[PDB]
Amino acid sequence: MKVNPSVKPICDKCRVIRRHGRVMVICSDPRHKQRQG
Amino acid sequence: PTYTPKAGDTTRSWYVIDASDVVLGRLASAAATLLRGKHKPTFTPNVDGGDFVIVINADKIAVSGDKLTKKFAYRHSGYPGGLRKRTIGELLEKHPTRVVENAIIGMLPHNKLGRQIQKKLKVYAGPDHPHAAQQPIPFEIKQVAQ
Amino acid sequence: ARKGILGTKLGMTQVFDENNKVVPVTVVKAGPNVVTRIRTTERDGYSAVQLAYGEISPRKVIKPVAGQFAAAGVNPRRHVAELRLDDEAAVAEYEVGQELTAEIFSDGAYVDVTGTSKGKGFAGTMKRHGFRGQGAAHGAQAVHRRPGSIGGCATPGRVFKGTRMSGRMGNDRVTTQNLKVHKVDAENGVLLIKGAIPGRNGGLVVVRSAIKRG
Amino acid sequence: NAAARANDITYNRLIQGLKAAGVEVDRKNLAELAVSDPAAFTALVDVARAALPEDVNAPS
Amino acid sequence: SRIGKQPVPVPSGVDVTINGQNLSVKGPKGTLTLDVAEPISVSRAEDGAIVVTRPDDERRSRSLHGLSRTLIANLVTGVTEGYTQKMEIFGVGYRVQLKGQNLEFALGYSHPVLIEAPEGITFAVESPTKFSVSGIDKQKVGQISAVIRRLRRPDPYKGKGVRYEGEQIRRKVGKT
RNA sequence: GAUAACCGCUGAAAGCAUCUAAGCGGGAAACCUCUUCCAAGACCAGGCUUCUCACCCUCUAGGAGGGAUAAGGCCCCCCG
RNA sequence: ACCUCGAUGUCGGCUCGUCGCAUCCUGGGGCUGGAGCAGGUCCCAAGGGUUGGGCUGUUCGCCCAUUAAAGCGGCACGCGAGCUGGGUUUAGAACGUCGUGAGACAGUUCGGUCUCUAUCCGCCGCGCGCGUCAGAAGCUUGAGGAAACCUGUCCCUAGU
């Protein structure tokens, strides 16, 4: 998990979602898994 | 001279409020009004001329938003790091009457008369209370329109 | 659900195990306890059994206690103490006038022994809380056993509650847990409990079944 | 305000209605009526409610 | 509008048993009770399909209606034909057996991992490396299947562990 | 028992739909029970027992003011 | 340069703490830039614990032997009406540099008084008095509090 203030897609597979009042990036590549905090 | 309650002209009345599906703050405001006696034309701020207020179904009080888990009731024991916090939901689960009690007590004035007034509040975490002998009046919280 | 017996700390001694290992055992007179009263959730709101222990003279016993024992149906005894039980079947096991002997425990049973610790009197911080004493030499002026600092400065501005200071120590309830019962002398109504139990010799103790190592 | 809400009217609208009706009884004697003469206070409340506009919240 | 208002085809052998906004649908396989949310009601749409409609249309009623119809369909399907999740175990030495009402796994741990079948859940082992969970409540079936999945921390290297009937796990190969 | 990260639901307000959306269900030492101790001055003071279930006097015969006390307890005394 | 110069005592050490989390164990995600493993880097979730010595005025540090680890800070750089007085900063003296000199020196050194019976709050313990709707008596009963919470190797699992 990449916990940074800014989360963005790192590839075309990454999708930005908002789960539990929190912007996150979900991807088939776990390396690109991000979270806002 | 303005009217002043003398000796035993303070007549007391018993009300019972059903806290089922009622907002905690609204119920506490109405109960504090009744316990102060602000609803009586003979109200004098230095006199405990309020009314007894039973609160039934205190466990079934309603709280909006996330107060049931995000709002905390705090107590410091006087010892270092002795701050215990219990969410409204946990407090309602463990001591259900205590949420309504705390709301009403906080809405009451903090002084000797306020603590005397507290004694007229009877919160119960169920549909029934033991004060049927007092013949309490069912009190529905109704707003006076303008 | 949890056995227990009122007794007296007769003393302490040593026995030897089957492997010839020395076992320091407190000898406790787990004398007969008479069930005087049963606490129930219906009548009392909790489940407990009231036990009475020790021979006392009826002249010594006062009228309120004498009447309580009469209502129980048993002869008055010096001490009375309650054993709390979890469920109602535990008290369904008991009955007033019941005879509780040391045999309720068995050899090898782990018990919790509760007793009133010895009175150490007004103790200093070194004895009472293990405070590191200040230096015996190297300039130390009359602070060899004194607490040292008590608080901070202006910012707390006061001393916190629970500050470990000197005061009366001992004479408090202590429950030593998981003490093995080396032997149950049924003939003498005695228990040899491995280790030490709180209090002076002759003091009232409560030997309950171990709450942890049941 | 206690007497007014017992009469089913707020204090502010009671004062508005009394002013509209031209009743010049000061709050001292209004409270005196509220305590000692609830019937008279109810009569004044009726006067104030009658004098109030058909719609208190109207742009008027 | 229409995809949430899709009538739920109720089969012949079903008794939904409404009592307001709380259904208790019974069928060939067990019974399932659902406390429907605020929006919708139920009148069977005559033909037999539980009608699902929302009173207003802002956002919350929209979502609750879309989910209520979906859950009603899932519930009727579960009570009529049930649900099954077929799962397969990979890894030399990884194995599963059915010990009556419980499922035992050998997944390389020093101990065999036991799984107590919860109410409404039944395990059936087709082979020492293939099994399946079955139940009338697929929420619970999927939950227990997920527990069985998580039994072993993901092995991107060898693929050892449990999976589903068809799953292309995130494999991982490279240097020596 | 309740909680980060990991999930489940049929799958939408939204189309082969989709971790999940709004709703609803499951997985650390921290938290709440659990263990030990204090604790009803917990001003919201429990199940039992003891006497009694008023002994007398005075202003009023309202409300009080004092003795004697039943019950039990101090103080003395021998002590730890 | 806003309180304090009709005085708010300094550094260090001792003693005693208390708090924060900005993590030195306990839970996870990614990397598996371990393809893998023993390990480790990185980022998210305080209960406890977080050693003893030498050289250091030593605030810092370095070193020795350990450790699971030898955390970082706040609290008047916590704590001198609790201690010490090594540093520092009086009065003596020597040397170095400057000065004609008296003397000066964030120069090197030796020596160099640490007062107070606690009134208030606070805290640690003990009582006495009243309450607690009759006057006592044992047994209690948890609202609320406090205490505790640490963690190592070795073996089997498995030379898997």
Ligand SMILES: CC[C@H]1OC(=O)[C@H](C)[C@@H](O[C@H]2C[C@@](C)(OC)[C@@H](O)[C@H](C)O2)[C@H](C)[C@@H](O[C@@H]2O[C@H](C)C[C@H](N(C)C)[C@H]2O)[C@](C)(O)C[C@@H](C)C(=O)[C@H](C)[C@@H](O)[C@]1(C)O
């Ligand atoms: C035994 C008997 C004496 O005790 C001492 O000598 C102690 C040991 C001094 O400290 C010794 C030792 C030491 C280190 O103590 C602080 C030192 O600084 C002083 C100069 O001398 C004291 C306390 C000095 O105070 C301190 O003076 C400093 C100038 C400031 C300080 N405070 C205001 C900041 C202040 O309290 C001072 C001047 O003597 C106080 C005045 C009132 C006195 O003269 C009184 C009469 C003293 O003679 C005395 C108390 O009887």
